[PDB]
């Protein structure tokens, strides 16, 4: 339990590894406008139990691989 960062799945062409974007609002720092900004971070998961297009809950973990330091906890959305 951190914030249980909600996100999506962008692509799975990898072996037990997925790609998650995260919706995120912000004040633009000088103009005062809300730009919907998204990030992109690799997430470890073993079962392939989430498909390309779901909605995913994520916490951190030990840094397993290169470029990937987040384990799946559970899924709240089918494809």
């Amino acid at each position: 339990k951190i914030r249980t960062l909600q996100g999506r799945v962008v692509s799975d062409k990898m072996e037990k590894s997925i790609v998650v974007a995260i919706e995120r609002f912000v004040k633009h720092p000088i103009y005062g406008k809300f730009i919907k900004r998204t990030t992109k971070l690799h997430v470890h998961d073993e079962n392939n139990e989430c498909g390309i297009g779901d909605v995913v809950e994520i916490r951190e973990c030990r840094p397993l691989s290169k470029t990937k330091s987040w384990t799946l906890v559970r899924v709240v959305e089918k494809a």
């Binding site: 633009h28 103009y31 406008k33 730009i35």
Partner: protein, 123 residues
Amino acid sequence: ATVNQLVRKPRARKVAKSNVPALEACPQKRGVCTRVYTTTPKKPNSALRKVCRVRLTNGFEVTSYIGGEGHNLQEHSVILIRGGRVKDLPGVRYHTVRGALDCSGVKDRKQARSKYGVKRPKA
């Protein structure tokens, strides 16, 4: 403008350039006296002025006005530059340090001494 036209590219500047290119971030550079030329100003003026092209030490060569009231220049020695362009002569964007290395003062001014090589007269 629209807010989503300043977002995707910022307000760019209105860029300002230098017009004393004998900076190299410095105020005074040394020069070794190419010649002395005596060219003429434009239409509202007359009475041809005293200029010298100057071999710098950064690598450049440029011209400079030799103001005062008469000068003293044999032309294979040292001067010192000041900036602050003459309006009249096309190409002279400098001055000379009136009273410096090898370019001595003017012959007895008595008002506004310090901007020329004139010191306290006798007292």
